[PDB]
Swiss-Prot record:
It is found in: Cytoplasm; Nucleus. Residues 79-97 are annotated as: Interaction with ASF1A. Found in a complex containing NCOA2; NCOA3; IKKA; IKKB and IKBKG. Probably part of a complex with HIF1A and EP300. Interacts with GATA1; the interaction results in acetylation and enhancement of transcriptional activity of GATA1. Interacts with MAF and ZCCHC12. Interacts with DAXX; the interaction is dependent on CBP sumoylation and results in suppression of the transcriptional activity via recruitment of HDAC2 to DAXX. Interacts with phosphorylated CREB1. Interacts with CITED4 (C-terminal region). Interacts (via the TAZ-type 1 domain) with HIF1A. (Microbial infection) Interacts with HTLV-1 Tax, p30II and HBZ. The KIX domain mediates binding to HIV-1 Tat. This is CREB-binding protein. It comes from Homo sapiens. Acetylates histones, giving a specific tag for transcriptional activation. Mediates acetylation of histone H3 at 'Lys-18' and 'Lys-27' (H3K18ac and H3K27ac, respectively). Also acetylates non-histone proteins, like DDX21, FBL, IRF2, MAFG, NCOA3, POLR1E/PAF53 and FOXO1. Binds specifically to phosphorylated CREB and enhances its transcriptional activity toward cAMP-responsive genes. Acts as a coactivator of ALX1. Acts as a circadian transcriptional coactivator which enhances the activity of the circadian transcriptional activators: NPAS2-BMAL1 and CLOCK-BMAL1 heterodimers. Residues 41-87 are annotated as: Interaction with histone. Methylation of the KIX domain by CARM1 blocks association with CREB. This results in the blockade of CREB signaling, and in activation of apoptotic response. Residues 2-109 form the Bromo domain. Disulfide bonds: none annotated.
């Protein structure tokens, strides 16, 4: 059993860690807009879009009852980017960096 605000305080530093990464978090800070980004097939491929702003809003409105639900949304965001983008993409490579940062940050948090 987790109290939403307690979980939020525990998890927020990990989300902050992602946001802190500049430029690597920039493609992830707002929801993908396929028309703006010149990726018109995006919503065909990515059925379950996720971004940092969405994760933050879920965290802030207590929609994560349990820490793995948060972790699952972070990895959803990563997996979407790896799925849509080519390995040669700026976004793909940025995503890989974010995943490294996240793993490094979420580990000591889950322990606590
Ligand atoms: C131009 C392609 O832009 C993207 C393509 C795919 C994705 C995902 C998350 O799959 C995201 C983006 N967006 C960006 O790269 C982006 C958007 C806004 C700003 C910046 C930036 O680096 O300043 C970068």
């Amino acid at each position: 059993i987790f109290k939403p605000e307690e979980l939020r305080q525990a998890l927020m530093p990990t989300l902050e860690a992602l946001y802190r990464q500049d430029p690597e978090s920039l493609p992830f800070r707002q929801p993908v807009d396929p028309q703006l980004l010149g990726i018109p097939d995006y919503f065909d491929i990515v059925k379950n879009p996720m971004d940092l702003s969405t994760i933050k809003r879920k965290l802030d409105t207590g929609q994560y009852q349990e820490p793995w639900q948060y972790v699952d949304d972070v990895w959803l965001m990563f997996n979407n980017a790896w799925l849509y983008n080519r390995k040669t993409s700026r976004v793909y490579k940025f995503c890989s960096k974010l995943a490294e940062v996240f793993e490094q940050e979420i580990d000591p948090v889950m322990q606590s």
